Design a protein around this ligand. Structure first.
Ligand code: AG
Length: 77
């Protein structure tokens, strides 16, 4: 199940492959607004996140809860 959220990218770590997003509440899945780390898979998945980090723009993103990891699927910027 792909979950769509929005927020501001605050951090990226290319070693841990984590993107930190200050995301809005997601009432669909009962999450409040949080600053939370999402795992990305490919180095090239980071490019859109790096652009969002630079602008600080409020961006769309999507992720899947794949086991007990929040795995990023997209960030539009
Ligand atoms: Ag969260």
């Amino acid at each position: 199940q792909v979950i769509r959220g929005s927020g501001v990218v605050k951090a990226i770590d290319m070693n841990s492959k984590k993107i930190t997003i200050s995301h809005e509440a997601i009432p669909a899945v009962g999450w409040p607004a949080m600053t939370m780390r999402f795992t990305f898979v490919n180095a090239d998945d980071a490019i859109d996140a790096i652009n969002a980090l630079k602008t600080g723009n409020h961006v769309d993103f999507s992720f899947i809860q794949q086991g007990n990891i929040s795995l990023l699927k997209s960030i539009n910027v």
